[PDB]
Amino acid sequence: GAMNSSNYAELFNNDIKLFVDDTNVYRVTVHKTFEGNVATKAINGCIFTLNPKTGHLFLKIIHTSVWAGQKRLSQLAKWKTAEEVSALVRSLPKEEQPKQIIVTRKAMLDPLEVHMLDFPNIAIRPTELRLPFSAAMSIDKLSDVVMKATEPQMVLFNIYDDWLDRISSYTAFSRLTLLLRALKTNEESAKMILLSDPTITIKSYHLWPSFTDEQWITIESQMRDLILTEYGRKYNV
Amino acid sequence: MNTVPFTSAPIEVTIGIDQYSFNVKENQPFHGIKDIPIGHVHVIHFQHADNSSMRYGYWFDCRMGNFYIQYDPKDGLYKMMEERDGAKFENIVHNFKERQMMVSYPKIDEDDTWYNLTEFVQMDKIRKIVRKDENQFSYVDSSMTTVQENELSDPAHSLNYTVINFKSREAIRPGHEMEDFLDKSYYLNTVMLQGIFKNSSNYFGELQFAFLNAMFFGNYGSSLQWHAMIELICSSATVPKHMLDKLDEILYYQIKTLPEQYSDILLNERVWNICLYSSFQKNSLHNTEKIMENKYPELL
Ligand SMILES: CCOc1ccc(B(O)O)cc1
Ligand SMILES: CCOc1ccc(B(O)O)cc1
């Protein structure tokens, strides 16, 4: 059934699985029309499909042309997500196909179940975790490729950079979720924390800076402090 | 006007005949039911006074044979049987009539209720849902599971209703996933009506039979089938106008007949609210919506 605190280590076992997050598929700016009405303008989006054991990120870029002439875009976006996840699975060799797909929003279950009827052995699950994958567009290199796309495109990343050379996938996922949660709670501060030291650079083939183990512990502390801080600013505690 | 005689009534039982039910006392001088209208299917059903567990009964059409009930003390139930000796049967019934040992099917002349509940139900289709081909009548009880329930255990004693499943390859065309899931017209009109049932009358007959088995035996899988067949229609944007109008009549008489006190277990809150208030056909079931809102506004 659902993925929650009690079965959290299942994410890091040897059964291939993917998280799917659709919160950045359909993105709009809202603006006033000359007549003083309100209209939306779509901007490019992306499906966030992540293997939490390996870090492999399948970033399907959703170009604004896919919405042209369509109605009920927020409902279409869930089906378009499901259509693209199903196409990815079919594109993978059998032994790379996931045994489970975990959606971050329950509204994806039926769209995905329906698109995956051909794969009755792939379990489609919700989760009670509140994961911060919506903040993936606060990672500059991911936001850049999304906004520059002029056509539908799939781009492959490792969201863990080279961390798995030194730490486990449980710790790598913990780090990622902490970073993303911070970026979601206060993007400016989070990015300030991540980049304040110009001697620590982001490799051309990486998403995050090249911190030593010692520097990551400090960074991770600063991110917790930020989250705690914002919780205080927010609730006045 | 036909007759179902009884050899006797040895155990105290509540006997149902269509929508009518009456009590028979242990060894009460009782020989059966007369004046049964020709032209409709009928159901004679039983609930023992000493164990209301297992309601059970028999669907039959008197045009297809001479049928009687005889208690079986080994199997512990009232069994339907066919008498092939037609002269023997007439003689037995005549004597039961002369001694006023039969209760009369109590139809009020104004009352089209049974016709309206069984309008599209046909013994030949009942016998394909309930497989027991050596008899011309069909046994149903409270506990019998459906072919779909067994997928999700004895196949000889199952209800072989048509499997309806909205998240199935049958229901969803490759490349029309969203379209077919949100508007089920393909599944209703091409798969089910053109493909499986052939016409709407056969679809309505199964729907009505499933309702009646839900109501008279509390058969849970029958209730599931009844609601699925309603939902498939209400969730289709394209339904022939004559089917919608007839559906409204069908459901109206079903809601009208339902025991007020059983609405909590025979009516699915989700399906009905969806069908009357959110579905494509939310405005197409005027009679049903009016009787539902005036009789079961709590469910809605
Ligand atoms: C207790 C069963 O009662 C009976 C009454 C009458 C007959 B008969 O043929 O009229 C048979 C049995
Ligand atoms: C032969 C008459 O047998 C009867 C059996 C039952 C009832 B009753 O109202 O429950 C009436 C008559």
CATH number at residue B172: 1.25.40.550
Q: Output the 3-class SS for chain B.
A: CEEEEECCCCCCEEEEECCEEEEECCCCCCCEEEEECCCCCEEEEEEECCEEEEEEEEEECHHHCEEEEEEECCCCEEEEEEECCHHHHHHHHHHHHHCCCCEECCCCCCCCHHHHHHCCCCHHHHHHHCCCCCCCCEEEECCCCEHHHHHCCCHHHCECCCCCCCCCCCCCCCCCHHHHHHCCHHHHHHHHHHHHHCCHHHHHHHHHHHHHHHHHHCCHHHHHHHHHHHHHHHCCCCCCHHHHHHHHHHHHHHHHHCCHHHHHHHCCHHHHHHHHHHCCCCCCCHHHHHHHHHHCCCCC
**Minimum distance, in Å, between the CA of residue B150 and any CA atom of chain A:** 18
Nearest-CB residue to B178 (from A79, A113, A117): A79
Strands (E), A14-66: 17-21, 27-32, 38-43, 45-50, 56-62
Which residues are CB-neighbours of A139 under 8 A, at least 6 positions away?
Answer: A183, A207, A208
Q: How far is the CA of B9 from the centre of ligand 2 (A)?
A: 11
Give yes or no for a contact between A200 and A215, defined as CB atoms under 8 angstroms apart. yes
Which residues are CB-neighbours of B148 under 8 A, at least 6 positions away?
Answer: B161, B163, B164, B165, B221, B224, B225
- For the beta sheet containing A153-158, the strands, ordered from the edge strand earlier in sequence to the opposite edge, are A123-125, A100-103, A17-21, A45-50, A56-62, A153-158
CATH fold of the domain at A164-237: Acyl-CoA Binding Protein (1.20.80)
Three-class secondary structure of residue A84 per DSSP = helix
Sign of CA pseudo-dihedral A102, A106, A112, A113: positive
Sign of CA pseudo-dihedral A167, A171, A173, A174: negative
Nearest-CB residue to A83 (from B167, B172, B177): B177
Q: CA nearest B27: which of B43, B13, B47?
A: B13
Contacts B167 to A, Cβ<8 Å: 110, 113-114, 117
- Quickly tell me which residue has 């005036």 as its tokens: B294
Please report which helix (H) or strand (E) contains residue A83, including its range: helix A73-91
Q: CA nearest B286: which of B241, B240, B236, B252?
A: B252
Give yes or no for a contact between A184 and A138, defined as CB atoms under 8 angstroms apart. yes
Residues near ligand 2 (Cβ within 6 A): B 22-24, 28, 30, 101, 103
Answer whether A110 sits within 8 Å of B167, measured CB to CB: yes
**Minimum distance, in Å, between the CA of residue A84 and any CA atom of chain B:** 12
Q: How far is the CA of B26 from the centre of ligand 1 (A)?
A: 13
Which ligand 2 atom sits closest to the C-alpha of B101? 1
Residue B105 CA: distances (Å) to CA of A127, B1, B226: 58, 9, 27
**A25 secondary structure, DSSP code:** T
State the Cα–Cα distance between residues B30 and B213, nearest whole angstrom: 26
State the Cα–Cα distance between residues B210 and B217, nearest whole angstrom: 10
**Minimum distance, in Å, between the CA of residue A73 and any CA atom of chain B:** 12
Q: CA nearest B259: which of B14, B19, B13?
A: B19
Give residue A94's identity as a one-letter amino acid code: K
State the Cα–Cα distance between residues A71 and A86, nearest whole angstrom: 22
Buried residues in A119-148 as b, exposed as e (16+ CB within 10 A) = beebbbbbbebebbbbbbbbbeebeebbee
State the Cα–Cα distance between residues B135 and B43, nearest whole angstrom: 15
State the Cα–Cα distance between residues B275 and B231, nearest whole angstrom: 7
**For A9-163, CATH number?**
3.30.420.230
State the Cα–Cα distance between residues B45 and B55, nearest whole angstrom: 7
Contacts A79 to B, Cβ<8 Å: 177-178
Residue B196 CA: distances (Å) to CA of A32, A47, B281: 53, 39, 23
State the Cα–Cα distance between residues A182 and A228, nearest whole angstrom: 10
Give yes or no for a contact between A44 and A27, defined as CB atoms under 8 angstroms apart. yes
Q: Whose CA is nearest to atom 2 of ligand 2?
A: B103
**A73 secondary structure, DSSP code:** H
State the Cα–Cα distance between residues B221 and B219, nearest whole angstrom: 6
Domain around B215:
116-299
Q: CA nearest A107: which of A44, A26, A185, A45?
A: A26
Q: Is B113 exposed, middle or buried (0-12, 13-18, 19+ CB in 10 A)?
A: middle
DSSP calls for A169-232 = HHHHHHHHHHHHHHHHH-HHHHHHHHHS-TTS---TT-SS----HHHHHHHHHHHHHHHHHHHH
Sign of CA pseudo-dihedral A133, A138, A142, A144: positive
Residue B297 CB neighbours (<10 A)? 8
Give yes or no for a contact between A128 and A4, defined as CB atoms under 8 angstroms apart. yes
State the Cα–Cα distance between residues A193 and A190, nearest whole angstrom: 5
Q: CA nearest A103: which of A76, A64, A133?
A: A133
Three-class secondary structure of residue A102 per DSSP = strand
Q: Is B79 exposed, middle or buried (0-12, 13-18, 19+ CB in 10 A)?
A: middle
Q: What resolution in angstroms does the PDB record give?
A: 1.6
Interface of B with A (CB under 8 A): 167-169, 172, 177-178, 181
Question: Residue A49: beta bridge partners?
Answer: A20, A58
The vertex-A96 CA angle with A91 and A99, nearest 5°, equals 105
State the Cα–Cα distance between residues B274 and B232, nearest whole angstrom: 11
State the Cα–Cα distance between residues B227 and B214, nearest whole angstrom: 11
Give yes or no for a contact between B106 and B114, defined as CB atoms under 8 angstroms apart. no
Which ligand 1 atom sits closest to the C-alpha of B10? 1
Q: How far is the CA of A201 from the centre of ligand 2 (A)?
A: 95
Q: How far is the CA of A41 from the centre of ligand 2 (A)?
A: 76
State the Cα–Cα distance between residues A46 and A137, nearest whole angstrom: 9
Q: CA nearest B271: which of B257, B260, B261, B281?
A: B281
